[PDB]
Symmetry: D2
Subunit: 312 residues, 4 copies
């Protein structure tokens, strides 16, 4: 239509309110170019490694935005420090293409990103990225499924923008997403049943065989964190990838999968914990350290936390 709220018309007009420099806008704007390009690549990732194109694409658009100074990728052993000539105030942690093995099976996959602000006065460095997820200034993910959706949580809310392929623009579709208090779906890889700790195994049981003789919870697990979390967000429910004996630390990385999603959830009123501490309050020591994550509708994550410390 004639006055279409693009993601840029939206981020630019909220940046004005902070009496800013334009860097958040430039950043998100260049990110989007990566997102549309990775989407087009996946919509034909059969007519003819994608990890790599994707990574180099995102590092590139972000360097050229004159808004970053440290960039942490799933794919890179050490953090990337941006050249002085192109530096800016933001720190971005991102996984450029999450759940990549799933592309053969046409499983929705996505790019996950969390942005921090470098606060110190010394040279850009890894330590600027070792902040609590609580201090993110913006986070979100783009989901490459039947449609390409970019969900963006900033200080003012969680918003959903959809890619309109006809004009190559992200259009604002859902404003100020709030999650449901309690929902009916539980999401978890039950093929690890024997590895699970006692609090999970009891919670699973009470959902399947509800003690109140009410409706059992439906199970859903796409196997791709973005598909599952986007689901937990728009429909409500609980998603869980907890520690187990094959992974006492959890599987999902703290800086670029758990803290962004957790920031998005808590901004929409959900909770996200490791079943012991809030995810967002964990203070990272390694830019690639893993975390247990349990996130979703509040009443359900809460029910799980009572089972956790009722077992103490």
């Amino acid at each position: 239509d004639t006055n279409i709220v693009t993601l840029t018309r939206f981020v630019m007009e909220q940046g004005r309110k902070a009496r800013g420099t334009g860097e958040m806008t430039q950043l998100l704007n260049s990110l989007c170019t990566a997102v549309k390009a990775i989407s087009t690549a996946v919509r034909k990732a059969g007519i003819a490694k994608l990890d790599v194109l994707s990574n180099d694409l995102v590092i590139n658009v972000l360097k050229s935005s004159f808004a970053t100074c440290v960039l942490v990728t799933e794919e890179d052993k050490n953090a990337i420090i941006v050249e002085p000539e192109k530096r800016g105030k933001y720190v971005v942690c991102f996984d450029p293409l999450d759940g990549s093995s799933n592309i053969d099976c046409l499983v929705s996959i996505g790019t996950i990103f969390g942005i921090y602000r470098k606060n110190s006065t010394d040279e850009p460095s890894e330590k600027d990225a070792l902040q609590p997820g609580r201090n993110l200034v913006a986070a979100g993910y783009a989901l490459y499924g039947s449609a390409t959706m970019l969900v963006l949580a900033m200080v003012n809310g969680v918003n959903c923008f959809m890619l309109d392929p006809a004009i190559g623009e992200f259009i604002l579709v859902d404003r100020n997403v709030k999650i449901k208090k309690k929902g009916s779906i539980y999401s978890i890889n039950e093929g690890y049943a024997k590895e699970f700790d006692p609090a999970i195994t009891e919670y699973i049981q009470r959902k399947k065989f509800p003690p109140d003789n009410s409706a059992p919870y439906g199970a859903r697990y796409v196997g791709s964190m973005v598909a599952d979390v986007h689901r937990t967000l728009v429909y409500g429910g609980i998603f869980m990838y907890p520690a187990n004996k094959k992974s006492p630390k959890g599987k999902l990385r703290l800086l670029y999968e758990c803290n962004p999603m957790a920031y998005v959830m808590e901004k929409a009123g959900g909770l996200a914990t490791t079943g012991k501490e809030a995810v967002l309050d964990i203070v990272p020591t390694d830019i690639h350290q893993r975390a247990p994550i349990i996130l979703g509708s509040p009443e359900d994550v809460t029910e799980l936390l009572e089972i956790y410390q009722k077992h103490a």
Copy 2:
């Protein structure tokens, strides 16, 4: 860049339907189905920026009528079968579900169009009786998945072939020829929310997947909740998919003519099994166009691990 020898689905069915002195009518049918599949893929892709299942249903009916290749059409969204008018008739019976899982759009989980094609084997007037053939009698069956990519999988007598929509030229382009599922897999797909109603065969099977007796690694679980998504993942990576019988859905949930049989035929033409637990899904004589049936499809060796167990509980 830009290839001169594009194998489109239309070209490919013609290098099958022609050597057989065949119809080439089939081709017109399928070419029409591709128009409906493309238009649904676009609507889904801008769904949140623009009911959809109904509109899909009307599209698939109009394109099918105008192929001059159908006489009877059964739909999930329609009671009695649609008997195509004589002017436009041709010999096939198409059974279809235009947008399985249409509830799931709001959460952007992949959904899809499933179809089974029968040939009318009679001298008579078309009537919905023409649709009630057992699955073994299918001439061609497959599905269209609307996901990160739009994939058309079409199984016909010789084998299963996958096609991907090249969004630029608007054509399904061949990407996997003569597909064959793994013999055994490492995944099982079932909604364990219904764990309470499950019949004993399944419960022992699932526990044997999770807690392996012969000390293997436990099978992973995966369950998208869209039939097409879980069937396609099972076809390419392998594994076992189960929507068995439980009490709340006592003869299964999935409809026989357009969901279970098309999948069962794609799956069996790719070397996998599809059973209800007692009999093969492709041998049930259909009685209501909307009759239901339980289905277990997947890698030969895992389906059979479940049949040994079914037999042990009768």
Copy 3:
């Protein structure tokens, strides 16, 4: 939004080729030509970000061969006619120019694919002799224009129909049915750079357009320099298009089999005339597949204003 009753070119030729108990082979031919036209439209649209005429030529030959509807193919880019192998043969002769004006891409002026389809009228082995029919014997002819939109115009026995490529679903969608050119127009299209070599008939005609004797307003001039662009503008707005004979190109520039005759047939099936200045272009017996011929096409009344003048100078 999203229409359920899309009239695609494939549906439309089937509601022509079917009532006539026809081929439906024609349909397969045309469906293949649409695949080539779409792939060329995309390549042009990213041309400056990615020879093209050669690659177009190979595409059109492969898609045409695989329609199982051709036996002889003549091209601007090929010497002797391509005789399709027996395995793939069918009854038509397609004469085509895969990318007229391909020089003009660099300046982003619209260019296009022109085609004429003949039916082989003999019991013999295909040979390029099968291509040398006069234009009156064309079964179907039209063009694809790559411009601000991609338009396919297809003229067949009954009339001319325009189709526009819906870029989202990748399908030519009908947008003008049974087209008819204006009787008289207000535009003349000719390259007056060649004003020195022009034969006297034309020179008096042009001066009568610019400096009207019967005190009308002078005709406007328009000359894109791409045959398809100027023919299409003449078909929809009217007017007269002239690439007559001059000395530097003494029998005209435009080739008869695939440029002049397809246009002349579209134009005459839309109620306009196409002559060389002495005879109608649709009656010349072709002798070389690359034979040339002058053409004047356009609104009946203006072509005739020029023929009165041609006759007055013989």
Copy 4:
């Protein structure tokens, strides 16, 4: 590819060099959203006035850019003054869809734009737009033909960007376009032959019947100024819409068709005159006043100017 120079990566990096505020970038960025949307509309302007959508679209994206303050359209009787809350330093004169009657005949058409800077301290007003075309700070056009091309002339050169429909991004394809000195094509509506003034009619003659007994000039006239000027630019030649007795003032409007094109030509080394004065040096009195325009390769426009004053 992975490091694709978008129009934004280009304008942003040249704006940095001026130690600017970001407004040129914001402006061109929002303009582009109009351009891609008008392109998509014309690529299906048959499967189902366009002037109007187009106009409302461009006024809208430009207001929301926080970079304009006066906007002059072909389509609007009076100038548009932007609301204070959304004002910025630039003045834009644009014709949103030039040659619109031509869409039925699938004639390439385009959006023409010229940007000035408001220099005075008083309230935004028409007079800020009444500047010489010599003072444009940026100008160009987007052409909606077989491809959508945006040609952009700024202080540093003329550059050509092409719309990649797959990613909805303008990619930089031709850097620092220079025109040919002399070319072989002349472009003009010869259906006005009797209305032409003597200098034109003689020039026409010497091209057709070259006095030097050399190659005659080829004639080309699409009837759509952008198609013809883009042609004159990339291939060289001369384009002419001079005064005649039906139009002693010319036809093409000074502020939004003649001055932008003339700015683009002179930046690529061509010339543009009314056959009496330079186009760019004309000082506008009415925001909609017309101008004779003759533009192209230098030697050819020059040849015409000698014929003009040889006739004095």
